[PDB]
Design a binder for this molecule. Structure first.
Ligand SMILES: COc1ccc2[nH]c(=O)c3c(C)nc(-c4ccccc4Cl)n3c2n1
Ligand SMILES: [Mg+2]
Ligand SMILES: [Zn+2]
Length: 313
């Protein structure tokens, strides 16, 4: 019980900031995650032995893809940790437990391809799950790992606490489908502006957790410019692979995904900041005022990508 994870001093202090980068040392990532669980949730939330076996099974079911990998999983968890820590009193015990595990598991067994490519390939997962295809698969893999022997970190919840937390995790992971983000955010925008937003209404809580998930998942856009720029190479490495596979199906890919049209990246990042990221972190800052540094970092990086187009870098 009295066995704490501690971090070196620089990490101990920077982990508390939204723009923290987990660094290049893979073998420190499990311990950074447990560190985050203990401070967010408590040293009692999970049996450490179970939690470690769960984390190491989660890690093994992430593939070696340029972006949708174990490092993404941990990075997305860390954003959720910073959000929860700056909003201490707004979330229940079950929610903090659930949300850190959903972030860690939200892209399980990702092959680095969109739902659109699965549907055009005619992949078996597309006939199994017509909408949010990869995300119904990420939730399925999560449930599978929980049911391996000695991996059930929720075993000490009541039956009904257990069902609540798997329902928090399923909605949180489904919410990472960006096709669902647009409508969810518009709805939240309307409820905020007409002041009908009500955090004691479950349906409203679900929508706010959804937006937090989108915000955590996109958090590469909120890092210090050098991190955000180097991450965008991994992002585009996956898009260009997908574009290559589209061309093999006789389908010309959008220029963003076409590895002959790299010039069109900066403007494809601007479109993504203006159409997706800025509005996301704006609505989030309106409902959760302490997440304001995410919107500021995102505005800073939008401005860095504008500079890239203007030829200044
Ligand atoms: C889904 O289309 C895009 C387009 C550009 C980006 N650029 C980014 O910076 C980015 C980041 C940080 N995360 C995603 C993203 C979001 C949802 C699903 C897949 C990805 Cl790659 N994207 C992008 N996703
Ligand atoms: Mg995903
Ligand atoms: Zn993700």
């Amino acid at each position: 019980g009295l066995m704490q994870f501690t971090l070196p001093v620089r990490l101990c202090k920077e982990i508390e900031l939204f723009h923290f980068d987990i660094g290049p040392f893979e073998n420190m990532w499990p311990g950074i995650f447990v560190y985050m669980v203990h401070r967010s949730c408590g040293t009692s939330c999970f049996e450490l032995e179970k939690l470690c076996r769960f984390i190491m099974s989660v890690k093994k079911n992430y593939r070696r893809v340029p972006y949708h990998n174990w490092k993404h999983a941990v990075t997305v968890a860390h954003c959720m940790y910073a959000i929860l820590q700056n909003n201490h009193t707004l979330f229940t015990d079950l929610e903090r437990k659930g949300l850190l595990i959903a972030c860690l598991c939200h892209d399980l067994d990702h092959r680095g391809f969109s739902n659109s490519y699965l549907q055009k390939f005619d992949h078996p997962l597309a006939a199994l799950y017509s909408t949010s295809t990869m995300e119904q698969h990420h939730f399925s893999q999560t449930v599978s790992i929980l049911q391996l022997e000695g991996h059930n970190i929720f075993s000490t919840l009541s039956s009904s606490e257990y069902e609540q937390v798997l329902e928090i995790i399923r909605k949180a992971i489904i919410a990472t489908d960006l096709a669902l983000y647009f409508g969810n955010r518009k709805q939240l925008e309307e409820m905020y502006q007409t002041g009908s937003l009500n955090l004691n209404n479950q349906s409203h809580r679900d929508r706010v957790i959804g937006l937090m998930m989108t915000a955590c998942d996109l958090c590469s856009v909120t890092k210090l410019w050098p991190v955000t720029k180097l991450t965008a190479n991994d992002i585009y490495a996956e898009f260009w692979a997908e574009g290559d596979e589209m061309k093999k199906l006789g389908i010309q890919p959008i220029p963003m995904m076409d590895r002959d049209k790299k010039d069109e990246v900066p403007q494809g990042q601007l479109g993504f900041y203006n159409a997706v990221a800025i509005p996301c972190y704006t609505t989030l800052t309106q409902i959760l005022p302490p997440t304001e540094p995410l919107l500021k970092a995102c505005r800073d990086n939008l401005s860095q990508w504008e500079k890239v187009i203007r030829g200044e870098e």
